[PDB]
Design a binder for this molecule. Structure first.
Ligand SMILES: CCCCCCCCCCCCCCCC(=O)O
Ligand SMILES: CCCCCCCCCCCCCCCC(=O)O
Ligand SMILES: CCCCCCCCCCCCCCCC(=O)O
Ligand SMILES: CCCCCCCCCCCCCCCC(=O)O
Ligand SMILES: CCCCCCCCCCCCCCCC(=O)O
Ligand SMILES: NC(=O)c1cnccn1
Ligand SMILES: NC(=O)c1cnccn1
Ligand SMILES: [Cl-]
Ligand SMILES: [Cl-]
Ligand SMILES: [Ru+3]
Ligand SMILES: [Ru+3]
Length: 583
């Protein structure tokens, strides 16, 4: 507690960081207000912040930040004209005014797609008015993502700024800058997805489920920490995410800072990997800690047999505290297996738990549960075999042809899915192969889990809204621990009725060779989906004949002069012989 809280935040973050976070905070609430407006409110709270720094006993400096924030929100003159119900929050008072404001945040504002400008425009606006360009751009992101944790948006923003500084003075501005922006775009979207997955888990599956996840990951993170230390970090982390899911930025930020400060005070009890994280400023501490790599596990850990199979007090220790015993099992297993995904560890714990629920009520428990560790081999191998098979495929073919292999397989399993959705799922899954199959076997499964979890929640909320399959709803509503296996065991839909032929879908023009490699790829892949949707009985060799003839057709009908006529002349020739090769 401090005499002036807005003073302590200004001194702590610094001016630049303050201005950026104030702009993000208000943009997330006044999503429909113009950029000029937010500039004027930021300058006004920034000047007020400084008077409180100069003298903490100055007027209004003693008020709380939630109160300061709501006060400024309520001095907006148009606020009833454009926000309406939000205006009535101003007639309440603290703390109900604050929670009223949170209720009236609109996750899905009806704002046009933020169009990427031309690289030379952006670089020129960059060079000529760095501030306005960066902040206008930052305002336009924050207003469209109002629930994206504000200091993480600033961490993403500062990387965008580094990409412009490096790339605007480069030889090929475009070749330097588009991969980086695309790189950042996906990452910010993966962060958004991870945040909502965690909240959604907390609300549907409960605290206990969430807690078992955190025990696994935390024990992988800090394998030399003691169970009691990890369990405290589990209880603190749950409180943090419970608060952060609720939406109040300042309360979520204090919970994260408090937890990071606790970790930094107890590095010896936690991990030897946090020294440099722990001398970063408050702004970066919890972010840095959250990204630090696992610590080394202790050298000669014993096997788990002693405590969890061979010991005689198994049923006694379990029954006196089922959750604490299971979490101790989870902690010992997860600290030993940084190569496993969290979900596969949770499967193991769920198998152990099911085993003791029936063994510990039986004639003699120990024979009943003597070989439950055997039941871990199949659960371990299924994911590791999936990674093996698919990383071999990615090297045999390439990203594009691995994406095309997945396109055919997933289109055959669930052909009711939109062609555009099928295209982007299979393409984003080729990119996960590219980044994870490049790790050794010992880090592939954690990497996959991290990215597949983004693709599956993304695909799921598209399903919740415009669903298309009952089997997908089953996969999207089941336990988060089982959601990837459920999708993996989706069988090829043999109930599917083929799609009628449409001659346009498989007719191609000269724009195909006047297109970007991406746009050409998306076009060819869109048609590969439609070929499977019209002929789902086609084999991979029957499809390769059609695909090999297509590629030669476009390499022949774009090296000629009357390319436009070849596309219809020889396009009618390839279509016909394709429909004779199939069906
Ligand atoms: C009247 C001003 C209100 C606006 C202030 C909003 C942002 C203040 C601080 C934001 C987060 C800073 C601390 C981050 C903590 C963490 O994530 O570890
Ligand atoms: C915003 C993404 C992660 C949220 C981080 C919450 C507070 C971080 C403080 C230290 C946490 C260390 C790692 C926690 C995440 C994990 O590995 O399960
Ligand atoms: C039934 C699926 C739910 C999600 C996965 C559950 C696996 C069972 C393991 C429960 C561990 C108990 C929570 C530990 C918290 C603590 O240490 O206090
Ligand atoms: C509206 C979109 C929802 C339906 C989309 C379902 C498409 C299935 C693709 C899921 C990918 C599964 C990831 C791993 C599965 C496997 O190993 O085969
Ligand atoms: C070299 C790029 C990889 C392969 C590109 C895949 C293109 C698949 C679409 C070709 C369909 C041609 C025949 C039409 C279908 C029909 O008539 O039944
Ligand atoms: N509204 C409050 O009670 C409050 C407390 N601490 C910081 C900010 N706001
Ligand atoms: N010119 C603009 O208003 C603008 C905004 N955001 C990005 C790019 N340009
Ligand atoms: Cl622009
Ligand atoms: Cl611009
Ligand atoms: Ru602009
Ligand atoms: Ru899995």
């Amino acid at each position: 507690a401090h005499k002036s809280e807005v003073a302590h935040r200004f001194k702590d973050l610094g001016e630049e960081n303050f201005k950026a976070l104030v702009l993000i905070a208000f943009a997330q609430y006044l999503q429909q207000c113009p950029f000029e407006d937010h500039v004027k409110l930021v300058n006004e709270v920034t000047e007020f912040a400084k008077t409180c720094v100069a003298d903490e006993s100055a007027e209004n400096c003693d008020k709380s930040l939630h109160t300061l924030f709501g006060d400024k929100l309520c001095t907006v003159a148009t606020l009833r004209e454009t926000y309406g119900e939000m205006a009535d929050c101003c007639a309440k008072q603290e703390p109900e005014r604050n929670e009223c404001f949170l209720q009236h945040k609109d996750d899905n504002p009806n704002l046009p797609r933020l169009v990427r400008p031309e690289v030379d425009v952006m670089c020129t606006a960059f060079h000529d008015n760095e501030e306005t360009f960066l902040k206008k751009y930052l305002y336009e992101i924050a207003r469209r993502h109002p629930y994206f944790y504000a200091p993480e948006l600033l961490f993403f923003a500062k990387r965008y700024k580094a990409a412009f500084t490096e790339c605007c003075q480069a030889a090929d501005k475009a070749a330097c800058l588009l991969p980086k922006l695309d790189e950042l775009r996906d990452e910010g979207k993966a962060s958004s997805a991870k945040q909502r997955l965690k909240c959604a888990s907390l609300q549907k599956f409960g605290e206990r489920a969430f807690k078992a996840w955190a025990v696994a990951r935390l024990s992988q993170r800090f394998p030399k920490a003691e169970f009691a230390e990890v369990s405290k970090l589990v209880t603190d982390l749950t409180k943090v995410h419970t608060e952060c899911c609720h939406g109040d930025l300042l309360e979520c930020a204090d919970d994260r800072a408090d937890l990071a400060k606790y970790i930094c005070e107890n590095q010896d009890s936690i991990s030897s990997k946090l020294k440099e994280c722990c001398e970063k400023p408050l702004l970066e501490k919890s972010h840095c800690i959250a990204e630090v790599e696992n610590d080394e596990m202790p050298a000669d850990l014993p096997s788990l047999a002693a405590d969890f199979v061979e010991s005689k007090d198994v049923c006694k220790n379990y029954a006196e505290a089922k959750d604490v015993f299971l979490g101790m099992f989870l902690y010992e297993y997860a600290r030993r297996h940084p190569d496993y995904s969290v979900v596969l560890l949770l499967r193991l714990a769920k198998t152990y738990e099911t085993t003791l629920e029936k063994c510990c009520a039986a004639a003699d428990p120990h024979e009943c549960y003597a070989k439950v560790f055997d039941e871990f081999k199949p659960l371990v191998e299924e994911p590791q075999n999936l990674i093996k098979q698919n990383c071999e495929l990615f090297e045999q073919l390439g990203e594009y042809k691995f994406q095309n292999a997945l396109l055919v397989r997933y289109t055959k399993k669930v052909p009711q899915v939109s062609t555009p959705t099928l295209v982007e799922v299979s393409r984003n899954l080729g990119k996960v192969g590219s980044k994870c199959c490049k790790h050794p076997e010992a880090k592939r499964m954690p990497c996959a889990e991290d990215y597949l979890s983004v693709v599956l929640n993304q695909l799921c909320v598209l399903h919740e809204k415009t669903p298309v399959s009952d089997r997908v709803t089953k996969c999207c509503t089941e336990s988060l621990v089982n959601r990837r296996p459920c999708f993996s065991a989706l069988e090829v839909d043999e109930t599917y009725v083929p799609k009628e032929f449409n001659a346009e879908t498989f007719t191609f023009h000269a724009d195909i060779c006047t297109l970007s490699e991406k746009e050409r790829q998306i076009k060819k892949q869109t048609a590969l989906v439609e070929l499977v949707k019209h002929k789902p009985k086609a084999t991979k060799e029957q499809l390769k004949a059609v695909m090999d003839d297509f590629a030669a057709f476009v390499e022949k009908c774009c090296k000629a002069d009357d390319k436009e006529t070849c596309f219809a002349e020889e396009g009618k020739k390839l279509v016909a012989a394709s429909q004779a090769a199939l069906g």
